[PDB]
């Protein structure tokens, strides 16, 4: 047990650096798309068209797990990439402060409000729709950035599955005292491994850097025209309301799948 627990932790550290690698690209291409200009006519329709004409299937392991019907919740209607349609439950209120310290509650509350779009696809769709219709935007460039963003955010959250398996191997005993307890319902234990999986100090650690990146990398240089309104807040919103919760939700589903290892 001793050596396998150490080696799993070594793999978790490597997997979390791959996870952190997706931050800057996601932020980069959001800003690249928003600086490019308005939305092209029928841009959403040509984006599903491009996805269908270039259907990138993922890791066999992941695809193996995506028709796991434990993992098929994170399977999307074609041609959209995985996990971009998964809906997290509304966990915050209408007026919750999102990015500023509140006495007695903290900062960066994770999850969705009533008025937040349901999934990353609706969210990225609402941002695109918030832009003005434009005659001069290049359709090929627009559609391709749009496509690139969809594959980036899907690749990001599904690294939660290898991360979960690495966490399980190292923290075997913690998880199986939950997974064996027959007192608790499956959803009642699902909630418990999720509290076991979440680490809000590191969430603040991550969202802090994401906020700094969304501000530094959206800086206006000499004679640049400004970004569309609220580009910075929507970048942070993507991480704080979708990327963080969907990832650990994938992590949780992967742990439940492995109650056969206790």
């Amino acid at each position: 047990s001793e050596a396998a627990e150490i080696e799993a932790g070594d793999r978790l550290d490597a997997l979390r650096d791959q996870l952190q690698r997706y931050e800057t690209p996601i932020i980069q291409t959001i800003l690249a798309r928003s600086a490019l200009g308005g939305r092209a006519p029928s841009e959403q329709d040509e984006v599903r068209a491009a996805l269908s004409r270039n259907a990138f299937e993922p890791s066999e392991v992941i695809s193996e797990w995506l028709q796991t019907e434990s993992g098929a919740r994170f399977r999307s209607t074609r041609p959209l990439p995985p996990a971009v349609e998964f809906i997290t439950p509304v966990v915050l209120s209408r007026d919750t402060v999102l990015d500023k310290p509140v006495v007695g509650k903290g900062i960066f509350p994770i999850g969705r409000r009533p008025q937040d779009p349901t999934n990353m696809d609706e969210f990225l769709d609402t941002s695109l729709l918030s832009l003005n219709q434009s005659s001069t935007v290049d359709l090929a460039s627009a559609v391709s950035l749009d496509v690139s963003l969809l594959h980036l955010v899907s690749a990001r959250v599904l690294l939660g599955y290898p991360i979960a398996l690495a966490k399980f191997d190292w923290l075997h005993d913690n998880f199986c005292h939950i997974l064996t307890n027959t007192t608790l319902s499956k959803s009642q234990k699902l909630a418990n491994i999720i509290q076991q999986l979440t680490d809000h100090k590191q969430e603040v650690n991550v969202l802090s850097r994401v906020e700094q990146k969304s501000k530094s990398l959206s800086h206006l240089f000499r004679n640049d025209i400004p970004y569309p309104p609220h580009t910075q807040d929507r970048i942070l919103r993507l991480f704080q309301a979708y990327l963080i919760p969907i990832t650990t939700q994938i992590e949780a589903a992967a742990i439940l799948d492995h109650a056969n290892k206790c």
Binding site: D17, P101, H200, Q202, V204
Partner: protein, 163 residues
């Protein structure tokens, strides 16, 4: 009363022992606490020393506000039980030392008593419960010697303010 929530297989990683005797010793079980001893009129704790300034490490800012805090600001971090899912963030507590002095300090961070022994925590163990981790201004205001690494204290959230 309080018991551990789980256990943690230690991992030295690249912990650089010859300068840090506190590294996870690799194959030791470290207890995890989402809990902390009961909060009372004068709750006993271990005062430790820390800087909340930005430096050297990719450490990251404090949890209550997305901020760094200069060593002349009187700020503290509490272990997860006392931190209590940010229920005390921004609160000022009164800390009392055996030399007879006291000081007010703002709760601003968490002393994670669950996570550790991975790359993100310098391969160091979880913080204990029962710890109050304070900036150098708290130690100076209390008249304590910083080279004394840890001292026994009490803390409360009572007011003692009414004139």
């Amino acid at each position: 009363t309080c018991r551990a929530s789980g256990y943690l297989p230690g991992r030295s990683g690249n912990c650089e022992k010859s300068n840090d005797p506190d590294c996870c010793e690799d194959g030791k079980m470290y207890p995890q606490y989402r809990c902390s001893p009961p909060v009372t009129a004068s709750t006993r704790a271990v005062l430790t020393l820390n800087s909340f300034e930005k430096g050297k490490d990719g450490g990251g800012p404090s949890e209550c506000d997305n901020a760094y805090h200069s060593d002349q600001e009187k700020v503290v971090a509490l272990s997860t039980g006392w931190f209590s899912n940010m229920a005390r963030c921004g609160h000022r507590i009164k800390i009392s030392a055996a030399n007879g002095n006291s000081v007010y300090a703002k709760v601003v961070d968490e002393c994670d008593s669950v996570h550790g022994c991975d790359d993100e925590h310098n391969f160091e163990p979880p913080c204990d419960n029962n710890i109050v981790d304070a900036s150098p201004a708290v130690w100076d205001a209390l008249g304590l010697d910083q080279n004394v690494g840890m001292v026994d204290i009490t803390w409360s959230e009572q007011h003692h303010h009414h004139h």
